């Protein structure tokens, strides 16, 4: 009954002192930073049996969120992203083609 999703992961790993050396906040609007990336993703991989995970990878996941509007990137602030809107996000007829004016069947012979 997992259903684990990155952004969420970074709210279990971003609400526990344990990994305050790799992942920590910044500001209070939700912003944060990945001090020790490779390990954060090291944690990630364990989760979702991805033993070959890493930042060059985990990064991309985040990068999509950019457009999926869940986490953007702060110009400069290396290793510093932020959750778009915080703290709100806390919560705690088969033949259709034949009749499409695109289809067309016939015969080779009829091609004169």
């Amino acid at each position: 009954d997992s259903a684990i999703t990155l952004w969420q992961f970074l709210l279990q790993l971003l609400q526990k002192p344990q990994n305050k050396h790799m992942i920590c906040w910044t500001s209070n609007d939700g912003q944060f930073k990945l001090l020790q990336a490779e390990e954060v993703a090291r944690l990630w991989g364990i989760r979702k049996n991805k033993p070959n995970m890493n930042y060059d990878k985990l990064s991309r996941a985040l990068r999509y969120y950019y457009v999926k509007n869940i986490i953007k990137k702060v110009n400069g602030q290396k290793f510093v992203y932020k959750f778009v809107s915080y703290p709100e996000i806390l919560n705690m007829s088969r033949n259709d083609y034949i009749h499409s004016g695109l289809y067309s069947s016939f015969t080779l012979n009829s091609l004169n």
Partner: protein, 86 residues
């Protein structure tokens, strides 16, 4: 159980005129559909052409690629091809 349900088959020429022609049919319907959905689902140009052993040439083509099969030009290009020796 009544019917064996979809049976797995060697992905190689079906050597049974009956089974083959029947397959070519069913699969021709699906792939056509697919083309139609691919194009309508993603507004992308798409052109499929399928020639039956019996000689029936079936074809799907989006607006911009229609000239591929309705133009006298391409119409003849298809002729040229499907008539080349085995």
């Amino acid at each position: 159980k009544k019917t064996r349900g979809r049976v797995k088959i060697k992905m190689e020429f079906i050597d049974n005129k009956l089974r083959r022609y029947t397959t070519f049919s069913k699969r021709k319907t699906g792939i056509m559909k697919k083309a139609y959905e691919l194009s309508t689902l993603t507004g992308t140009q798409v052109l499929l052409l399928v020639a039956s052993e019996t000689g029936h040439v079936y074809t799907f083509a989006t607006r911009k690629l229609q000239p591929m099969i309705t133009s006298e030009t391409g119409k003849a290009l298809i002729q040229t091809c499907l008539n080349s020796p085995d």
